[PDB]
Amino acid sequence: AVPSVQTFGKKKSATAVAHVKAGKGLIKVNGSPITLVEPEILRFKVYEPLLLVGLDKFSNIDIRVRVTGGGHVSQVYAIRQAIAKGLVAYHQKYVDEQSKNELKKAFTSYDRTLLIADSRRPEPK
Amino acid sequence: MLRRQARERREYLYRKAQELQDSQLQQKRQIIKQALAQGKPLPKELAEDESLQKDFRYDQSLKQVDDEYAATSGIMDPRIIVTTSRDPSTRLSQFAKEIKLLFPNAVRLNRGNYVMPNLVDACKKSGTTDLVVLHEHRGVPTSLTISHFPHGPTAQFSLHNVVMRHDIINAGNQSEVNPHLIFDNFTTALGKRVVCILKHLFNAGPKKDSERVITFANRGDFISVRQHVYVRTREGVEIAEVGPRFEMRLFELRLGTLENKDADVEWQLRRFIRTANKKDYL
Amino acid sequence: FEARQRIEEKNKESSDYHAKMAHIVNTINTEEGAEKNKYERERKLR
């Protein structure tokens, strides 16, 4: 079977499911290329994982992201979280753990929300 | 937490259903105790019940506040959150503050986009005891619901003849001592249930010379709520209204938090039954 | 105001009727039942 992994990113009501497998560097969101993600102003946000770890790592995998719920901004954050988690999980399962550690270190150094959910649960005072 | 809370409710619900079954058994033991003390003959059913007579030896050495409130009654002071409906008017925000001052241990919280399941879950984490939610109609308070955590009950009231303290000029500031409480004309079991719910919103053990009194007066199921400050004179007592005035009429009482719309109803108001007018339940 | 008066009057009237009907039924049972039992025992004695 083709090696594949599945991950979830979540932001408010927005939920993104990322499927990462062996491939040739094909990143798609909702059946379209990642370059067409909207709004354009926040597009680089969803690019943040791809750029932080370098496009060379993605040359050997295909990522498919399906997003449902929430608004534009929350959907963007769900997409980026799902992409980062999927890359880390794939490198965990089907590549050395050293690269997993480097990926986690880079993502956590830049923005921990890429990996851990940002949940603003109420806190009474 | 979630697993612990769920099981504790099931055990609590299971305990009740057994108690209803045990009620007949308890009465039977009372008959046996009376017969031994008085010497009168036992009834035929008890006479031929060998198991109960054997059990009576162990059960001979057997001996209030409601079960939800029994655990913490008079031990832990209540923790109360007073909130409102979404996008409250200015008057409702002012009234919510007045209710906050009414209870010594109340904290006012803004409900902007808070979800009801989220609100109860957040309050349960922090150890909150009760939650008060207020509704309004064109800047006039209409309803008041009190949800006791972690498992109820939830009592909903409708407010009439509300006179806020903001309507008074040069009123001044309130005193925030632990107040004395007056519950007048609560007779029925439902009345006792309502009294228990309202009593526990306050701190236990007010000072004997405490100069603030809160009275809940029942007059035909319309509980008049007043707040007064008194000075003991040489030939009597002189009191003064501090406000606010409002009359609250119970119309629902459920065994669960305000979030759970599926909670089993302890009591509801039947308005369209033909004999609705005649009897006062409280 | 008129609604309040009508409800109170109706409740008062209903209570009196139930008391009155209970009284006439109870007194009939007690006094006529006593003669009923009192007659029946003589027939038993006979």
Place this chain on the structure above:
Amino acid sequence: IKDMFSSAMEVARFEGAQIKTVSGIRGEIKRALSKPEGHYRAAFEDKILMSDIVILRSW
């Protein structure tokens, strides 16, 4: 409900009155609607249908 009264002034006289449907569902005259004249709001013990007819008994 409509066609029971001609103006909101009449409804206010009967506010709180007891009413029922042909099916036997009991209700109450809650408030008079501002628009149009004579229309009013009522609450019933159970959901009523459009085919139902509401009746106010009076003497």
Place this chain on the structure above:
Amino acid sequence: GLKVPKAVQKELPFKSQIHQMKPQKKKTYMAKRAVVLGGDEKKARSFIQKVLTISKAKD
């Protein structure tokens, strides 16, 4: 008939999950292959489903 909300139907325990078969829209090959005997068999197949209709109603 009662229709369960999809939110409730999703988070149901394994034992009690309602089985709801979706309709098929693409024509299946077996649906395109099966032969139905017409003429005499049609008259002998309408007759039976009439007889079983009477018998169920009578019982």
Place this chain on the structure above:
Amino acid sequence: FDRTAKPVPVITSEVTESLEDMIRRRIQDSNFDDLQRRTL
């Protein structure tokens, strides 16, 4: 006509005075129904 519900009571001056008399009596007798701290 019949009315299904009793109207909400009106707070007249006489109603307040009757309510006030009860409160003054309770304070004078010093009898209040309030939660009492449990021993231990």
Place this chain on the structure above:
Amino acid sequence: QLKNLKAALKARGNPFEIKAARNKRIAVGKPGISKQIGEEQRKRAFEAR
């Protein structure tokens, strides 16, 4: 309010029966007294009917 009350009573030896409006440039009425008069006049009229 109590501290004013103690000061008043010691000098000598209910603002809720009045609503006071806000001056945009003050007691306006008497609810308990007016409603009582308003309720009593129709009460005697009901007695007449």
Place this chain on the structure above:
RNA sequence: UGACGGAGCCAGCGAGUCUAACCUUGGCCGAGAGGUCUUGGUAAAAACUCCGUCGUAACGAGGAAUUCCUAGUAAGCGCAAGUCAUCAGCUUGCGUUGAUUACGUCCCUGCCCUUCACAC
């Protein structure tokens, strides 16, 4: 920090064989009841992003005083439901976008409390 038009695109609540106008002009049939047709008037996701055009009597963002407010908070936007009290001159939910400023102090104003080691 506009109007007009077009294009792209993102929610969560909600499902009782139950959901819903008024007043007229006339044809035909019918014993009637009424049925059908015809006719005029009245009433009745948004934000967001991209592109193209124009173009900057009463009142022009609201005095004095006064009130409220600390994070998914203030504020903006829309969509549902009407759940025995209350509500439609409206009420309650649901999601979407989402900040500034404090998180210290008892200086002022109120309320409140006090007068089993070692070390003090």
